[PDB]
Design a protein around this ligand. Structure first.
Ligand SMILES: N[C@@H](C[C@]1(C(=O)O)C[C@H]2OC[C@@H](O)[C@@H](O)[C@H]2O1)C(=O)O
Length: 256
């Protein structure tokens, strides 16, 4: 039989979550979410089974000064996993070092905050000195700011960098808690903002989307699976399955 594929992934609602249970769960049964459903669909089309493994360092992936990567991206570069199935953003810097499938979802960076402030945009957020802000450490949102040549965003990066210990958060859970408990706004992808703001009515998006991009399945460069995964994604796209999966996992209007 075909070798069982190793899938690197990361906890991120509603893509990859621990299934609720009255008893201990093991293996792939521990997890549920959009990305688990995506894997069930892709694996049917391609003819494989798979082992879901959370990325040990809990990061999506960014490169340091020497060009050393971490996170799921490093797992692929180092051939520790066959696929990364996650809300993994397709970017120029990543595409140079791994092979992404075509996108299964699109999104853009925006701002998550609490209600009641006059802040209406990134410009407003960067200018004011009352609220802290930042991004998840070593993901694509952080990298967007790090790489930006747009003045407002360059300033925002300098700010995050100067306060990195608190401005750059471990993961989206800590980021959201920071928003709820302190005067902090989180730079976050719009699909996650849509999910959280329909569930916690104390939270809101600020401004519009500041970029536009997609999530793709990651594979190591030269992978014999990337092209088959792309073809499978297009099938699911065209058949309306991706849309159905989004509807299934996004709770729909819970807040005014
Ligand atoms: N999708 C990103 C990771 C991340 C981000 O950098 O914004 C972290 C996590 O943060 C919350 C929300 O944006 C979610 O999609 C996740 O995106 C990536 O591939 O690096």
């Amino acid at each position: 039989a075909n070798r069982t594929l190793i899938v690197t992934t990361i906890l991120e609602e509603p893509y990859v979550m621990y299934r609720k249970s009255d008893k201990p769960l093991y293996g792939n049964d521990r997890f549920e979410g959009y990305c688990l459903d995506l894997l069930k669909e892709l694996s049917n089309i391609l003819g494989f089974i798979y082992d879901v493994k959370l990325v040990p360092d809990g990061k999506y992936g960014a490169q340091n000064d020497k060009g050393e990567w971490n996170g799921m991206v490093k797992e692929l570069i180092d051939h520790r996993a066959d696929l990364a199935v996650a809300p993994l953003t397709i970017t120029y810097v990543r595409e140079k070092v791994i092979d992404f499938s075509k996108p299964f979802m699109t999104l853009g960076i925006s701002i998550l905050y609490r209600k009641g402030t006059p802040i209406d945009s990134a410009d407003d957020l960067a200018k004011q000195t009352k609220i802290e802000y930042g991004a998840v450490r070593d993901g694509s949102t952080m990298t967007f700011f790090k790489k930006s040549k747009i003045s407002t965003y360059e300033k925002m990066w300098a700010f995050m960098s100067s306060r990195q210990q608190t401005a750059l958060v471990r993961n989206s859970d800590e980021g959201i808690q920071r928003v709820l408990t302190t005067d902090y706004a989180l730079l976050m992808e719009s699909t996650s903002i849509e999910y959280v703001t329909q569930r916690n009515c104390n939270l809101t998006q600020i401004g519009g989307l500041i970029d536009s991009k997609g999530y793709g399945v990651g594979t190591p460069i030269g992978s014999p699976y990337r092209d088959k995964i792309t073809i499978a994604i297009l099938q699911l796209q065209e058949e309306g399955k991706l849309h159905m999966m989004k509807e299934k996992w996004w709770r729909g209007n819970g807040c005014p």
